């Protein structure tokens, strides 16, 4: 229940405190070798960030896991694209790794995904996303991706299901509270809320192509065996 009392200030704080650290990085095989290794490495501070997201541990060891397996690629890119946002034309995978559009065509079908990634960064940019807004979005995305792929047969996962909506609702207030600060009309405010929320869906789409692409590169044995990353795959 703790998740539901905190306020738009109280909230946007914890979503800030939980923020993962900027992780530095380290043929088609190699390119993919590269983002896999960062991807695998981010994939731990993601877990760690998930736990410190209000309402999550409130979730269930099984639901926690399933939201993550559902959303992991989505969060990587929402974050990817955000990092990438002041770098028009580029994907700031790490600081020490500022990949470009055409560098996406070192991998089969990769450029197009990039192409999607970049456009959202554009969007987020030209829309002027703010960190608070973003931390918000990121959590929303974590909470809403696996929400409607649960095993809704146990009345314990029917508590769980409606919990998430409550949180998710709170989060949207937070966002609201946030947007009210900027000083937009209530039109422009929810004109906004609709702004972001849609993007998310383009992010699901992107995560999905992305998840297929990853799985294929697995097939060609062109991705290293990053145990954690690989097991993120093997739940789709």
């Amino acid at each position: 229940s703790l998740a539901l009392s905190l306020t738009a200030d109280q909230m946007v704080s914890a979503l800030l405190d939980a923020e993962p650290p900027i992780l530095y990085s380290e043929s088609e095989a190699s390119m993919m070798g590269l983002l896999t290794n960062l991807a695998d490495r981010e994939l731990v501070h993601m877990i760690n960030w998930a736990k410190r997201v209000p309402g999550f541990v409130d979730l269930t060891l099984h639901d926690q896991v399933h939201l993550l397996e559902c959303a992991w690629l989505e969060i990587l890119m929402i974050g990817l694209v955000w990092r990438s946002m002041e770098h028009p034309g580029k994907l700031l995978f790490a600081p020490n790794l500022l990949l470009d559009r055409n560098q996406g065509k070192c991998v089969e079908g990769m450029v197009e995904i990039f192409d999607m990634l970049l456009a959202t960064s554009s969007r987020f940019r030209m829309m002027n996303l703010q960190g608070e807004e973003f931390v918000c979005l990121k959590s929303i995305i974590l909470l809403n991706s696996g929400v409607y792929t649960f095993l809704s047969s146990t009345l314990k996962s029917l508590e769980e299901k409606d919990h998430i909506h409550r949180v998710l609702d709170k989060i949207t207030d937070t966002l609201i509270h946030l947007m009210a600060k900027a000083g937009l009309t209530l039109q422009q405010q929810h004109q906004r809320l609709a702004q972001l929320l849609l993007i998310l869906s383009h992010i699901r789409h992107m995560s999905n192509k992305g998840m297929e692409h990853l799985y294929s590169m697995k097939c060609k044995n062109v991705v290293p065996l990053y145990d954690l990353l690989l097991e993120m795959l093997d739940a789709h």
């Binding site: 731990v44 877990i47 760690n48 998930a50 736990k51 060891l61 926690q64 896991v65 993550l68 397996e69 145990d227 954690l228 097991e231 993120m232």
Partner: peptide
């Protein structure tokens, strides 16, 4: 049956 399962806990 896991790293995800052990890091999350």
């Amino acid at each position: 049956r896991x790293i995800x399962a052990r890091x999350x806990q």
